[PDB]
Amino acid sequence: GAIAGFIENGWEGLIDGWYGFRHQNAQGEGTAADYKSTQSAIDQITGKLNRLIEKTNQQFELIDNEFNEVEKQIGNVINWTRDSITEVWSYNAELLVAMENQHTIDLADSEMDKLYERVKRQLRENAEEDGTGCFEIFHKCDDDCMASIRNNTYDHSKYREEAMQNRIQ
Amino acid sequence: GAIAGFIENGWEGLIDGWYGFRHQNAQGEGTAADYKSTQSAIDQITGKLNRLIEKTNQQFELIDNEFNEVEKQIGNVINWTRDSITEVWSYNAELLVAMENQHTIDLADSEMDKLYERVKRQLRENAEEDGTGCFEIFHKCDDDCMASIRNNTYDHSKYREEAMQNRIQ
Amino acid sequence: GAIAGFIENGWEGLIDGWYGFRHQNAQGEGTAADYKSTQSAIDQITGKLNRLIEKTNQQFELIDNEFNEVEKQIGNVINWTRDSITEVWSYNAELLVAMENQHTIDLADSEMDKLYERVKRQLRENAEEDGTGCFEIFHKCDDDCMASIRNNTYDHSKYREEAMQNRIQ
Amino acid sequence: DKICLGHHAVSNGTKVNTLTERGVEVVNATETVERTNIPRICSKGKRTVDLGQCGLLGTITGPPQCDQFLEFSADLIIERREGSDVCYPGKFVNEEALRQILRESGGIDKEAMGFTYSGIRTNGATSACRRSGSSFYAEMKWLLSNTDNAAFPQMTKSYKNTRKSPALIVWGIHHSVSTAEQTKLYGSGNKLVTVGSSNYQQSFVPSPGARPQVNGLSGRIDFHWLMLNPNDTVTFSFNGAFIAPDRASFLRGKSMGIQSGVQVDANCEGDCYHSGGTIISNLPFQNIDSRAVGKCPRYVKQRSLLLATGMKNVPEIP
Amino acid sequence: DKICLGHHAVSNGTKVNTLTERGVEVVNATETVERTNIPRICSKGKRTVDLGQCGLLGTITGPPQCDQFLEFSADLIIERREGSDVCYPGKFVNEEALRQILRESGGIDKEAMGFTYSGIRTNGATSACRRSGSSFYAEMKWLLSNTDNAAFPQMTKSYKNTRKSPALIVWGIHHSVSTAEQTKLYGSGNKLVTVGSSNYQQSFVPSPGARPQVNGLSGRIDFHWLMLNPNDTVTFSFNGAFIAPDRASFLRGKSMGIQSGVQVDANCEGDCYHSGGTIISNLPFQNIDSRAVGKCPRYVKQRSLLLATGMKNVPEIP
Amino acid sequence: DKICLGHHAVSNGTKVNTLTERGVEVVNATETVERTNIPRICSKGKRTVDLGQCGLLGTITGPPQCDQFLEFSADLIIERREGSDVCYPGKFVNEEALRQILRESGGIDKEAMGFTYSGIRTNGATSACRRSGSSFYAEMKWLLSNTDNAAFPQMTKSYKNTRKSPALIVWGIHHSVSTAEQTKLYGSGNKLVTVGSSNYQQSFVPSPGARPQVNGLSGRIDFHWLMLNPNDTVTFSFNGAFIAPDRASFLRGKSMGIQSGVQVDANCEGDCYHSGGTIISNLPFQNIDSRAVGKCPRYVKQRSLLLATGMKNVPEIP
């Protein structure tokens, strides 16, 4: 009946954002999305999308004919050239997409890590990593305290005494 | 007479895997390979290899002649076109390999880091990083205990008292 | 009147290197550059630069004429071919630069992280992350001690008693 | 007590490809290769002419089919398969080069070259060019001897282009079904047609002989053309078997020509065309037609290349 | 007491290139550029003909060298440098275009065109085409006057393609060493050959004159060809200097032609060929021949491009 | 008390593009697309000839303008727009192919073909080729009948290439302004010129007729050429309207030809040229001219593509 983080699954309930928080305390279990990490990820992906929508100003016209077939030699030269550049663009397209998808996946993994690392630096010496991508908080953290972590207003100074006490015996 | 991790060398003795563990205790020094990290790395590299074996269905035929040389003008046009696309593929080949090798090296570095980070989260508060990519374990860890870490059956709860005691005075 | 690290700004005063240290103690505030991280970054960027200076041995000659325009059909075939490969190189150039710049930025971010992570492993249990990319040092670290960190001659064993004492009450 | 960091996921994951994996599921992806075709010619904004049964080269010489397009004006030009450049059986020399010129001409402006003739018939007509009765190319003049078998006088006609644009000049050589028929029209003896410019020089001889019957005719009229530079002059020297031009052609401006087999639509706006319709897409690639023309996404062999628009999808532990 | 995380390494490191470094050692790498050549023509699975001394165009007209290949059938076609299309000195007009057609023809099927002649000799033969004695092209007929200097009758021969495939029709024009020799063969006066189709129209004149001696002959026979559409007809009108066809050609199916100088091997199976052999490789690129044909890896200028198949190699601290 | 890790930054940040962002500021960047042009022809190290008013093809036939370049030698060859291949109005057949050959010839070596003539005039001259007085092409011989209207004897001239390099042979056909003028020069009746090799065969007929006046002349001399293989022979059979060669041409070695409109500079060293100057750059791309030739960076449509040579720039918190 525990909760788990990114290190061993995603959240099909996180429907209002890409990245988020899931806590549990005396008030119970809850889930909210983080804006800054989600927006960064979305900004970068849409950035790729715009970069591929940018149309070309090159206009191309007919050099052969599918009603009156051109002379054989010049026709085969044309077809040979067209199929050659078709091979090139097919290669380019395949590689571009494969390359971008590799990057899209990685930069998303980065954002997840940066979020996790941020929270860690917030909690200072008041928490420990449980291995599943979660933090065991060694003091009482009500809904108000949990919200304070999500909006970066958590001051570890307030709970450091109580926390360090519990972490040691 | 100490042992060292990835942060300052590789292991020419690690011959049964890409990534692994090296420990030392009362029973002595030992070295085993990690399956999950090694397999992941191998799966990705072979994945690249298959992606480059995928043959093209484009068949190309002769448009010139090396016995009876074609007309000069159309011949120079053909040669100019061929050398142009040759330049393109030579560029593509050079860049593709350079790009992939950069990725192969990085993703291997990632796997190493992920392994190191995993072990860290296992040992919790029972160990400290020595700087060479190793963990000083602040309790007694026999061969059985060392094997428990490698197969992720190590419970830090069992050693936390003994460990925290030694880390502080 | 505090100082801050990479996690929330750069240093316009760091004019003798790409990466560096900024400390403050009883002797005051100071700033020096790290050689190894800076050199690595510079070596990689210049490496890209050389990789793009490598000239081509392909020589190309005229296949048309801008004084006496060639025959229309063969002329349009030539122009169609040239504009096609121009499209390809324009694509290649655009993507190459975009791809390299993405990498240049990331590898620089990596170097910053590696430097931060290195210092962390040096200070062991004698310091805590303040969240801005800085380390609160829980013992007295004079200019001599600060220099010891920068050239990796800092021995955490010397300050561990004093440090662990201050971190706990 | 505990706070966890996570990321969203779906049970509705879609597979993409990367450098390493084939079929790695991501949360969300989109298509890069366009395959959606509009089986119409989106002509909104562009002045469009559907040549129908008129061949593009016919607009210059003027068979009955092209009588409407003798001085047409367009932004977009459409050729139809049923089209024909010819009434009296024949073909253009360097036909395709000329087509390519007319496809981006913006249409043509015609102007009388002002040739005048003396002891000679000009009313040459045929059954293959029916217009009310028998007729001939509207822009051309079929020159004959005078009565029958009579000698065709050596003639020399010249035309000067007093405009700032090149002039499209066209002329024909007539190949009779026999030397008998050639003599009946232009007289006995050998016949020669020389066409000289300041940048062009050619020569032509008729070639009487039996050909297969096209449009009930075994004779062939072959057409030749040149572009005449501004202030330059063409001179025609001939003594028979010569199809003379009556008017020259001047290109109106800029356009684009396609070959289509689907209807024209004037409501939709487009810029990429192929024989089967209009490609309207912001996608970078397409798998519809490799010979598509205009402003188009690049053609590729693949029917689909999915671009990840979301993170790697990882199902939640039940 | 202590556990360390590490990675393997070797003293046998191999250098590769990346975006930043040149010569960075990795644990293991593999080649992407193929350079291993098989100096044979791997013909297993493909029906193969080695034309040897027969030129590909000779299979149509039929000099002695090509008597075996008059109706050949193949999947793979090989031309040899020693090959020749000709016995009586001459060359094809638009020769290369025709070669390209025959290279992917799958071979040829021959069929009598059924031309019949009257007051005329057809047994024209030469020393250059020896077959037992003097002879001529197997598929052609060298037409003469009748006795000597006698007039050659104006003739008209036509052929209709009653098949569902285009017919390859070939004919020759004979250029005598002198107007004297031309008169002796076809009679005095000028000579004309006109060839008409429904899609083709041309005309030809002989050109008597002294040429250098090839095969002991200063005369030249030049060949012309066209593809005849199904249900279409060709008509030949001539009065001398005409080399008539006896049979037409029909393409059998699909094939591929190469020019090689190495032996044929029937045990090895291949799909990429060049003049020096067969390229069999799963590698994406090759540095063997830029003009390699078939299903081949792309040609590149580089002889080697190493792909890292292992991590960065870092030697162990001694 | 505290130690911080950081990176440098500037207020003088420069924007670049990546896979995701457009206009992301980095610390330092450099240009990849060259746009700096040197409006000269850097000819240092290369033997250079500025043809000026001599057309490249004129170096072979030899009008007055090209008298200096009849046997020129060069590493770099420059054509000028004012150049002309011709004195007596005319043009080369397959002119551009020939130009391309001469552009990389390294210059030409001329050698007498040793033609001798009998009952015939060879001193044909014109006002269009003034050299002191009226004259003709230096390397050619304008052959006439003898007196006026007199018959031109059938002749046969042959030349053998006894060198190890192909010989560039050129000859001309003269088209008189009228059949009257043709008769006055070469006599009555039809005229024929046949040119035979072991690899080449062609035939030519004059074409008398009125052309527009170029250089005060309505006559046209058209030039034909072939490459003669080592040990091979050319034979000329003719009876009038023939412009004979006096010398053959042999290519000196290797070179490169350009068309420029800017001065030559001998101090600067270059390797990439276009009509407007020299491109000297280590940059991979250029936006100067798509038709630039030599060893050049690739042409691209973009005027600028900035490559980041520094980290992402992040301003310091005030």
Ligand SMILES: CC(=O)N[C@@H]1[C@@H](O[C@@H]2O[C@H](CO)[C@@H](O[C@@H]3O[C@H](CO)[C@H](O)[C@H](O[C@]4(C(=O)O)C[C@H](O)[C@@H](NC(C)=O)[C@H]([C@H](O)[C@H](O)CO)O4)[C@H]3O)[C@H](O)[C@H]2NC(C)=O)[C@@H](O)[C@@H](CO)O[C@H]1O
């Ligand atoms: C050639 C051939 O197939 N061999 C014949 C057979 O075929 C006949 O050939 C004749 C000769 O060409 C055909 O005569 C032509 O018929 C046309 C109708 O199909 C038409 O009537 C042609 O006359 C005109 C025309 O109307 O267009 C009359 C114009 O006034 C003329 N204009 C000028 C300026 O002269 C013009 C010219 O006479 C020619 O077109 C110039 O090329 O055309 C007319 O010439 C006849 O139609 C063919 N008929 C058939 C059934 O094939 C058979 O006659 C056969 C009978 O023994 O004999 C073969 O030799």
Ligand SMILES: CC(=O)N[C@@H]1[C@@H](O[C@@H]2O[C@H](CO)[C@@H](O[C@@H]3O[C@H](CO)[C@H](O)[C@H](O[C@]4(C(=O)O)C[C@H](O)[C@@H](NC(C)=O)[C@H]([C@H](O)[C@H](O)CO)O4)[C@H]3O)[C@H](O)[C@H]2NC(C)=O)[C@@H](O)[C@@H](CO)O[C@H]1O
């Ligand atoms: C042209 C030339 O070099 N100038 C001559 C010199 O060269 C001789 O030229 C003659 C004329 O062409 C050559 O005669 C030819 O020799 C052939 C053998 O080499 C052969 O015998 C030719 O006869 C046949 C043939 O066997 O092929 C006979 C066939 O039956 C003919 N078939 C038909 C249908 O007619 C056929 C035709 O006669 C022609 O091939 C049609 O083009 O060919 C025969 O014509 C002679 O071989 C050349 N000899 C040499 C040594 O060069 C010298 O004779 C010189 C002597 O004064 O005179 C020059 O003018």
Ligand SMILES: CC(=O)N[C@@H]1[C@@H](O[C@@H]2O[C@H](CO)[C@@H](O[C@@H]3O[C@H](CO)[C@H](O)[C@H](O[C@]4(C(=O)O)C[C@H](O)[C@@H](NC(C)=O)[C@H]([C@H](O)[C@H](O)CO)O4)[C@H]3O)[C@H](O)[C@H]2NC(C)=O)[C@@H](O)[C@@H](CO)O[C@H]1O
């Ligand atoms: C053709 C035309 O425009 N129609 C005429 C008008 O134009 C005249 O045409 C004549 C005929 O061509 C021109 O005569 C030529 O003038 C030249 C000077 O411009 C020159 O004098 C030509 O003579 C030489 C020459 O000097 O080059 C003399 C050489 O010795 C000859 N060499 C040889 C080997 O024969 C050579 C040949 O005679 C020809 O060049 C061979 O092609 O050229 C001379 O022929 C005359 O210049 C044109 N004048 C004008 C004003 O256009 C008018 O004469 C008009 C008057 O009624 O009649 C039209 O029919």
Ligand SMILES: *[C@@H]1O[C@H](CO)[C@@H](O[C@@H]2O[C@H](CO)[C@@H](O)[C@H](O)[C@H]2NC(C)=O)[C@H](O)[C@H]1NC(C)=O
């Ligand atoms: C899945 O990806 C598609 C494609 O990027 C997203 O659809 C886009 O939505 C934005 C905003 O609504 C539009 O501007 C785009 O035009 C849409 N593209 C397409 C192809 O429809 C979609 O939003 C993504 N799914 C989710 C859940 O965000």
Ligand SMILES: *[C@@H]1O[C@H](CO)[C@@H](O[C@@H]2O[C@H](CO)[C@@H](O)[C@H](O)[C@H]2NC(C)=O)[C@H](O)[C@H]1NC(C)=O
């Ligand atoms: C070094 O790299 C090569 C190339 O990937 C590896 O050789 C491959 O081995 C697998 C399995 O044995 C085969 O399926 C491939 O066909 C081999 N490729 C080649 C080119 O031989 C080799 O295994 C790698 N070295 C090590 C130690 O793993």
Ligand SMILES: *[C@@H]1O[C@H](CO)[C@@H](O[C@@H]2O[C@H](CO)[C@@H](O)[C@H](O)[C@H]2NC(C)=O)[C@H](O)[C@H]1NC(C)=O
């Ligand atoms: C900004 O980038 C430019 C381009 O890399 C740097 O200028 C280079 O400096 C090195 C060493 O002085 C030279 O070898 C290169 O030729 C220079 N390139 C150019 C284009 O001038 C410059 O150093 C960078 N700025 C800083 C502050 O380092």
Ligand SMILES: *[C@@H]1O[C@H](CO)[C@@H](O)[C@H](O)[C@H]1NC(C)=O
């Ligand atoms: C060019 O390619 C098209 C498409 O396959 C083909 O139909 C046509 O015949 C080719 N042209 C020639 C001259 O073979």
Ligand SMILES: *[C@@H]1O[C@H](CO)[C@@H](O)[C@H](O)[C@H]1NC(C)=O
């Ligand atoms: C085409 O390139 C080949 C290879 O260098 C060369 O031998 C041939 O001469 C070229 N073709 C022409 C027409 O120059």
Ligand SMILES: *[C@@H]1O[C@H](CO)[C@@H](O)[C@H](O)[C@H]1NC(C)=O
């Ligand atoms: C080739 O392109 C140039 C550059 O626009 C143009 O001037 C020229 O007319 C084109 N060639 C032909 C034959 O149209």
